[PDB]
Design a protein around this nucleic acid. Structure first.
Ligand SMILES: *C[C@@](*)(O)[C@H](CCCNC(N)=[NH2+])NC(=O)[C@@H]1CCCN1C(=O)[C@H](N)Cc1ccccc1
Ligand SMILES: CC(=O)N[C@@H]1[C@@H](O)[C@H](O)[C@@H](CO)O[C@H]1O
Ligand code: NA
Ligand code: NA
Lengths: 26, 251
DNA sequence: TCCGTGGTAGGGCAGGTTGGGGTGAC
DNA sequence: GGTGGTGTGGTTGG
């Protein structure tokens, strides 16, 4: 329900150090 | 995980450690999908060519961890298993087809900063994201080379590969229940899962809604991070109705 | 155009927690 | 220690 939204990342609008790498791959 | 790096804290809160009660040893990865259910690779539990067949009371799962061995007080959750469910069509002999299992926890787990379920993909997400070239992310405490193990959780990002390339890469018969991921030899960048990382999640972040989805389970390989060779992952969206049925039937 | 009857394996030819549908594979 | 540390914060108490 709540799935997929990390408390310390998405719920703070804070990105992890390599996630853009994924998003640029789309 | 070969050629990855240390995970940030809370970076993969659905990551689960499959543990054996005695000897106290780490068997595999797994992932949190509901408050009562964990998804791993079947071969983590049952692998008859080596007479492996673990009961419900042989194992624990540890959720919320970062350190491999140390008890992470007021951070981790240790849970006992109610029931193990292996896919009836799991083929241990030939190619680890449908290499998937579900473990029902004896009690529901409380989510937190460190413990939190990943989403399983719908049709649209899956259509959209399972495309060669897109990168996803694999995590685990498996081995760092192929010939030792990490102090904390390892993460690496790797691209999904075209099926004909995956098919040509390996001698083994591959089914449409599995996909492969990795860099090619002329792409320069490197990386792979390795032994001990089985059951760990291959995940992707949805550009449409910001959620992370589990597209794969670390299933198999030949070596780890060998040029021309790619990591093989259980195609999770293909087996989602089994996952559904079991949950809804035995929750 | 094909994707069950044994296989990873019982009992049976349907269906189940399983024979669907897919960046399909032949 | 209970779970490491020539430890007393940390991803967490004291
Ligand atoms: C069980 C998991 O820890 C492990 C993960 C290996 C992933 N490796 C890479 N490079 N991504 N799985 C395995 O080791 C599986 C389980 C048993 C055999 N196996 C293999 O990888 C063999 N190397 C290949 C194989 C042998 C027999 C049947 C299928 C695959
Ligand atoms: C393939 C295999 O060995 N499966 C066994 C199963 O027959 C048995 O009911 C259970 C309890 O021992 O362990 C598992
Ligand atoms: Na059957
Ligand atoms: Na301490």
């Amino acid at each position: 329900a709540d799935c997929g939204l990390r408390p310390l990342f998405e719920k703070k609008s804070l990105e992890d150090k390599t996630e853009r790498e994924l998003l640029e791959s789309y | 995980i070969v050629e990855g790096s240390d995970a940030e804290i809370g970076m993969s809160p659905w990551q689960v450690m499959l543990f054996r009660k005695s000897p106290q040893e780490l068997l595999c990865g797994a992932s949190l999908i509901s408050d009562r259910w964990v998804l791993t690779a079947a071969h983590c539990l049952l692998y008859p060519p080596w007479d492996k067949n673990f009961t419900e009371n042989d194992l624990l799962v540890r959720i919320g961890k970062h350190s491999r061995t140390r008890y992470e007080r007021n951070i981790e959750k240790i849970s006992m298993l109610e029931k193990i469910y292996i896919h009836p069509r799991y083929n241990w002999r030939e190619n680890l087809d449908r290499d998937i299992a579900l473990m029902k926890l004896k009690k529901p787990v409380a989510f937190s900063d460190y413990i939190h379920p990943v989403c399983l993909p719908d049709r649209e997400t899956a259509a959209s994201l399972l495309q060669a070239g897109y990168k996803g992310r694999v995590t685990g405490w498996g081995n760092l080379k192929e010939t030792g193990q990490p102090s904390v959780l390892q993460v690496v990002n790797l691209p999904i590969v075209e099926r004909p390339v995956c098919k040509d890469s390996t001698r083994i018969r591959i089914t449409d229940n599995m996909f492969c991921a990795g860099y090619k030899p002329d792409e320069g960048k490197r990386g792979d899962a390795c032994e001990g990382d089985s059951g760990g999640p291959f995940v992707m972040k949805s550009p449409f809604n910001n959620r992370w989805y589990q597209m794969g389970i670390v299933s198999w390989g030949e070596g780890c991070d060998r040029d021309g060779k790619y990591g093989f992952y259980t195609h999770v969206f293909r087996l989602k109705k089994w996952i559904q049925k079991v949950i809804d039937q035995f929750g």
